[PDB]
Design a protein around this ligand. Structure first.
Ligand code: MG
Lengths: 807, 807
């Protein structure tokens, strides 16, 4: 009948634009010397030396005059000295290209659709990539001209990626720049001696580059819709969603500096399989009697997911290439892994819809849902909802205004469930875990022991081990929610918007609860722990017009606000600070995620302020001074109060569309103001010893720590050990996370239809676009991303060129 | 738009209706007894007991008077004696159901298609099933009216089977009927003591019943067709065909009489992937200048297949249920398995077509194919073809004969490549087989030894084992086929048919040739071994008509005939047998498969026959007597001649269609005439001792084998040892397999269009059918399936009810 064709294509370059700055290899020594002399041991007896000619100023203080490092890091000259930018070393400009062609055909009789597309992505991490092919094929048929439709949706995907390893950027930022990339032969460089037991990340990436998965996913449905007469039709649909991931991971042997493997080669070939199917059947009747309108609907839907996975492991390979490293060619020992899980949900439902004329509307809904995840004392759970509005501008007493285009007054109340918890929540789980599986520094937890004292060479006797305690009285998390709002439109639909207010109250919150310590192994269980309150207001306001000199504009902002309150909690649960006041104060009556901690009042600027302040264990000159809230003249542990609050003062957003002379400009600003933010990145940027591993690289800012020669710095001095417990929960780690993000900007040129039609087109538009271009942040923030405080690096900046084609 | 709906359904009961009859537990004793007295030893010393009270018949010939066994076959009363119809026990009435719905809308802008089929098979072996779901969803789209159409094809399968284990039936037939299905406590029956080392089939079917694979395959293409002006269109098309098998195989402990697993539990988690993709481009121009008509096409096509598989095996499970037995839950030791293979083909090709207005016709074709399978020196081969035809009834001198409607004279000469060999056929392959895989009676060939003498307890040294020697000059198998034929039609399209003659010449036949013994391990290689020849005539003759009384009838006749001969082999190959000749005579000049053996002129009825005969190492009274082809007085290894040739004298086939008064009866007959077939079932049916396993259970026609109390019988006497070498290659095992078979027969009733239209149908038909319902034997044949001589059972007889609906 009518055939539509749409083509789209993009390229997008993608760049990290900022990161936590870390020590130069030059400054890494300045930082150490300063730490050593602050603590009064000879700076020249360091394990990494780094030889200094320092001394004192006529003032008694120490002064650094100069540094020398001896070309190689060892007395054998295997590892030359470098000044590596480990971030720039494992980082690329990312590049994205994608195209998509889609074509639809709608006769009346039926209508089909077809779609191909491709996306490819050079990661911003080196030796990483990702690609995806999609095909979509949808269609329907009218078997009996207004009585039997039959139809199908289908989508087919194939993905292939080499993923970046578990936090490598994090591991690039704390590998001192003194380490080189390459050793002196040309090997992969790496630590030597007492430098930190961190492996070369550029090398990690290479050793990873052949670990690629391949993922296929089929998902769609078929449906019949039968209309037995007038305004009543029934219809079932059936759907599946099958996915499949296969990959091989390679262990290759490495011996870079002190990082050895000693000579381990292995292969793991793993398989994963997810199979979800679903089936509903739905009948609807609707009427229409002059000033009377009604919908009623009734139906049910089954779901069922069964997923499952397994794996084959073999060590020792005579050729170190992915062509040879298949389990068949392995010589050494082997392991086999795999399990599976699943659940099924069943749901029955109905909806009521009624309207008088077009002024007063009413709607009721009722569902009963049941979940595999529960007993059967609590399998099912019924949820009701009622909502009703009043189109006021249809009241005839209103009418006279006439500029007031529309005005409703909505009010809803309903309940909804949550059973999104582990598939084996209710069970006491005992695993036979024999210990066939990697760990770190021990913690097999393996239940297999050489009882005979033979030292092994054989199969040991195995056991069972508890993974979880059950909860055979575990029930749904019901959430009760109550909305009321006012929709408005004005001046010939040029000023549109809304104002609503919500109150959400959740009951029998589902969480997984770490068990008390003396309970021992697998003390965690899934429990319901009480209630939480959430409520606030929303505002939407759009203004779309078009000035005399031909400039279409459409603005549409949003502003929000909400207060959160933890209501009840089991004493144990309030005691152990999970919701959660750090175990020093309960949270009931405060906010989900509120934290109690010590409060840091700058630092001690001479020996007098230390005596003129409570007996503080490790209080010295230059250390952090924590106020006393005892007001008993000692610090101890009762000292603290509430110091962190996650809830923002309000969050806002504003979307800008413009069109002028075929040019086409759009923006989207989001932001939040007045928000507390707590983070650990300072522990790596303000201290030389606020970590558990020695001599890792540190942030750039502790270069400006307090010292004799440099005071009135907020930042404590530099020591070789955390004697003052600086890494206790304090306000040192709470900063201001107010910001204003420019999510997206996109400028477009659309070629005039008068001549885009000359080439058998219709729409022909080019555009340029950026994502996360810029953020506007508080002065009080140490750095990086305010809405991801925990990360030492920001999000990557995209910049895109692209076109659309119309036909 | 024109919408067509199609529904087809079928149910279908499957039944065995014959099998080789084996011994009653009553007879088994009679057969053992006869062999015992025959060789002259006390039949009461049987290891299976079985006590007889026999004697002599007033002629000096032994007579059986009676048998008895005990309640139990053992001095422990665990295995009671039975008369187990073992075939009947593992055999079922199979059952099939399938439906198929399909729907197709055809608009002039484009057409689409949708199909949903389901098929389920209860196998005729117990504890085996099979089911398949399919969704097809094709379509196309006219983007520019008859200039630029775009299209797709998609198909999606999901099979799930449990496959009967290899040779279950062939195990059910050599298990003695005395062994009970159940032991006397209700566990599983099995052998005990001297009875043969062979497990209860019914129990093997149980232990197999959860070894279930879940296969998913999806294949299709997308294409574009660009037709610029008229007669010239470019087409490229891309297609893929991806599939996935996964199963778990469960090994559970068993102890059944003298049949122990030693309490083994294991689980293998297999996984296979098969991925093919195909791309081509095809240009086609075609011309039509009045009398003349042309078609030239040109284009290329690349194919690539990569497949792979891997496997995780684990032992020892505290719960013997498929729900417990995942690799994770295992406790004993683990193996990991897997590898991959792949190939690619490139193909270029052109085509010519031409004629003067359906009178004289010419077509040339040329293609040049390439295969990764070969070395670079013979990657590509070129293949010409030319054919030409002459519709001679279009001639202006033949209008006289008016009965004659049509007559064409076709004639072809072509070449065609064969390339289907092992992916790695060109290579010398060295596997690093360590020995991580199952075997029977050893013969791991594991290349892993305990060089230190420690008896193991850890990971042993390993090596490499040659798997095959490579060619570095292997090449294509060409086939030069040439045909000539006559297509005719007489008496107003009522007496139709063809007669053609063909000549096929293969050159450099591609086979896998095993090495000679003294080369030992590896040895095997793929080579080209000379040429073979095939020529024949084919003939078809139909007769369609409709009598005066409303009976249409259509009789398709068909009668093949052909001869086969090898022309040229390498010296070492003609000698080693392989293609015939058994190592005793070269085949060069005889039919592929021709065999050479001793020739068996019946059996000796008295010592006069033994003595006036020729010297025959182990001749006796009752034995087979082999003739003295040599004419030298002795019977040795020079004594055989050609005794087997598999070309029939002529094959034939016949179809019968009969319409009458809305009924629709059809039949299909196939048949071969005048063939030798050679088998091996006679070793199981005619001899007590011609196997390598003890006792076993044997055919029923060793129950009229020769004895003094029963002479004039073709079947040798029973002995306890094959001292005469009866199982030498003899004509005792060649029979006549000339058969005739009713493939299919089907009665249908089509509800008259004029009433199937009043209710929306169009075609409405029911039918009942039968597959392999009967077979004509030619009584000189000992039994079962003459066109499957090597089997002990036939194909099952299918009976099927079904409907067809078209709207
Ligand atoms: Mg002889």
């Amino acid at each position: 009948g009518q055939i539509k064709i749409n083509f789209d294509a993009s390229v997008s370059a993608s760049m990290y634009q900022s990161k936590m700055n870390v020590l130069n290899t030059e400054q890494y020594g300045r930082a150490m010397w300063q730490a050593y002399v602050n603590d009064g041991e000879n700076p020249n007896g360091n394990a990494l030396g780094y030889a200094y000619n320092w001394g004192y100023n006529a003032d008694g203080n120490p002064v650094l005059y100069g540094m020398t490092l001896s070309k190689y890091l060892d007395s054998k000259n295997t590892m030359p000295v470098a000044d590596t930018d480990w971030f720039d070393e494992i980082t690329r400009t990312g590049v994205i290209q994608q195209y998509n062609l889609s074509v639809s055909n709608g006769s009346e009789k039926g209508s089909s659709f077809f779609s191909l597309g491709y996306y490819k992505n050079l990661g911003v991490i080196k030796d990483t990539d990702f690609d995806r092919f999609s095909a979509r094929m949808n269609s329907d048929y009218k078997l009996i001209d207004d009585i039997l439709t039959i139809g199908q949706h289908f989508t087919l995907n194939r993905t292939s990626e080499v993923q970046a390893p578990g936090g490598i950027i994090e591991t690039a930022l704390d590998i001192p720049s003194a380490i080189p990339v390459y050793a002196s032969d040309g090997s992969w460089g790496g630590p030597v001696g007492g430098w930190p037991d961190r492996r070369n990340p550029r090398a990690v990436l290479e050793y990873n580059k052949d670990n690629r998965y391949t993922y296929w996913r089929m998902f769609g449905d078929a449906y019949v819709n039968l209309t037995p007469f007038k305004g009543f039709n029934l219809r079932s649909t059936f759907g599946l969603d099958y996915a499949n991931k296969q990959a091989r991971y390679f262990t290759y042997p490495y011996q870079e500096g002190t990082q050895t493997n000693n000579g381990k080669s292995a292969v793991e070939a793993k398989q994963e399989h997810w199979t979800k199917w679903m089936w509903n059947a739905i009948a609807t009747y609707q009427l229409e009697v002059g000033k009377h309108r009604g919908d009623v609907m009734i139906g049910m839907e089954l779901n069922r997911e069964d997923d499952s996975h397994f794996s084959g492991y073999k060590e020792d390979f005579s050729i170190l290439t992915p062509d040879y490293m298949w389990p068949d060619a392995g010589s050494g020992t082997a392991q086999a892994y795999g399990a599976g899980e699943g659940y099924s949900l069943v749901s029955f439902f109905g909806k009521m819809n009624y309207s008088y004329a077009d002024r007063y509307l009413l709607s009721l809904t009722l569902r009963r849902d049941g979940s595999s995840r529960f007993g059967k004392n609590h399998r099912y759970a019924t949820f009701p909802s009622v909502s009703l509005g009043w189109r006021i501008t249809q009241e005839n007493f209103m009418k006279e205004l006439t500029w007031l285009d529309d005005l409703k007054l909505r009010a809803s109340w309903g309940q909804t469930g949550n059973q999104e918890i582990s598939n084996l929540a209710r069970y006491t789980i005992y695993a036979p875990n024999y210990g066939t599986t990697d760990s770190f520094g021990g913690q097999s937890y393996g239940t297999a022991y050489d009882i005979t004292g033979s030292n092994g060479g054989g199969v040991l006797p195995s056991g069972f081990k508890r993974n979880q305690i059950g909860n055979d009285n575990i029930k749904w998390e019901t959430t009760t929610q109550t909305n009321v709002g006012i929709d408005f439109s004005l001046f010939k639909q040029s000023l549109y918007g809304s104002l609503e207010y919500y109150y959400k109250k959740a009951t029998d919150i589902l969480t997984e609860m770490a068990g008390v310590g003396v309970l021992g192994e697998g003390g965690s269980r899934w429990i319901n722990s009480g209630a939480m309150k959430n409520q606030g207001f929303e505002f939407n306001l759009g203004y779309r017009n078009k000035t005399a000199f031909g400039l279409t504009y459409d603005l549409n902002g949003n502003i929000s606000t909400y207060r959160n309150e933890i209501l009840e909690l089991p004493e144990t649960v309030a005691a152990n600070g999970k919701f959660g006041g750090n175990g020093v104060k309960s949270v009931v009556g405060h906010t989900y995620g509120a934290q109690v901690g010590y409060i840091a009042d700058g630092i001690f600027k001479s020996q007098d302020e230390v005596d003129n302040h409570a007996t503080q264990e490790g209080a010295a000159v230059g250390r952090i001074r924590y106020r006393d809230i005892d007001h008993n003249g000692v610090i101890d542990e009762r000292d603290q109060n509430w110091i962190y609050d996650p809830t923002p003062s309000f969050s806002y957003g504003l979307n800008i569309y413009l069109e002028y002379k075929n040019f086409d400009l759009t923006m989207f600003w989001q932001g939040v103001q007045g928000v507390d933010i707590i983070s650990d990145v300072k522990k790596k940027s303000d201290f030389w010893s606020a970590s558990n591993v020695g001599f890792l690289n540190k942030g750039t800012r502790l270069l400006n720590a307090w010292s004799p020669t440099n005071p009135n710095s907020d930042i404590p001095a530099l020591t070789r050990s955390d004697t003052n417990n600086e890494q206790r929960v304090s306000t040192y780690f709470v900063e201001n996370g107010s910001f204003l993000k420019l999510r997206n900007i996109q400028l477009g040129y659309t070629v005039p239809a008068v001549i885009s039609k000359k080439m058998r087109m219709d729409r022909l538009r080019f555009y340029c676009s950026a994502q996360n271009l810029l953020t506007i942040k508080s002065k009080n923030f140490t750095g990086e991303d305010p809405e991801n405080p925990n990360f030492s690096y920001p999000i990557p900046v995209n910049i895109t060129f692209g076109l659309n084609i119309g036909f």
